[PDB]
């Protein structure tokens, strides 16, 4: 009996990169949202988010964040919170040329190195004070509600 698809790697590499600018917003959503098993292409999303191409606000993101199965909520934290708050996947407002505001995913932190999904690079990882310093004290939390069958 192979009943089972769970072998199908129909893109288990939901860390997506297209399209990056200042709406990254949208893009590094596309990565959580197809991590969390929604799946969302980059484009339905930025029509979604709304995510304004001037240096938009997490507060939008979220918004359409909330709406994909997953509860996204905009605070501020400190660098050490880094480490123990949020563990998942989540949203960072992180500044790029001191000047356009850009998102990444958090994947994993540890030895002080942070891995962000960042939607040009892909999968880059940045030192614990370095991101500190791109990182502006703009975190999103995000939790899979209605993503996660109950029961």
């Not at 698809?5 to 200042?22: E, G, H």
């Not at 994993?108 to 991101?131: C, E, L």
Request: positive net charge; hydrophobic residues 40%; proline residues 2%.
């Amino acid at each position: 009996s192979n009943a089972m698809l769970r072998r199908l790697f129909k893109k288990k590499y939901v860390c997506v990169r297209q399209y990056d600018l200042t709406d990254a917003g949208a893009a590094c959503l596309s990565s959580i949202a197809q991590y969390y098993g929604l799946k969302m292409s980059l484009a339905k999303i930025r029509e979604m988010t709304g995510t304004d191409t001037q240096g938009t606000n997490a507060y939008g993101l979220i918004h359409a964040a909330k709406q994909l199965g997953f509860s996204a909520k905009g605070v501020k934290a400190s660098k050490e919170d880094l480490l123990k708050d949020f563990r998942l996947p989540a949203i960072a407002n992180v500044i790029v040329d001191n000047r356009l505001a850009h998102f990444v995913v958090i994947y994993s932190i540890k030895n002080r190195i942070i891995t962000v999904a960042d939607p040009g690079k892909g999968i880059v990882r940045y030192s614990m004070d370095d991101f500190c310093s791109i990182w502006t004290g703009g975190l999103v939390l995000l939790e899979p509600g209605e993503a996660f069958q109950k029961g």
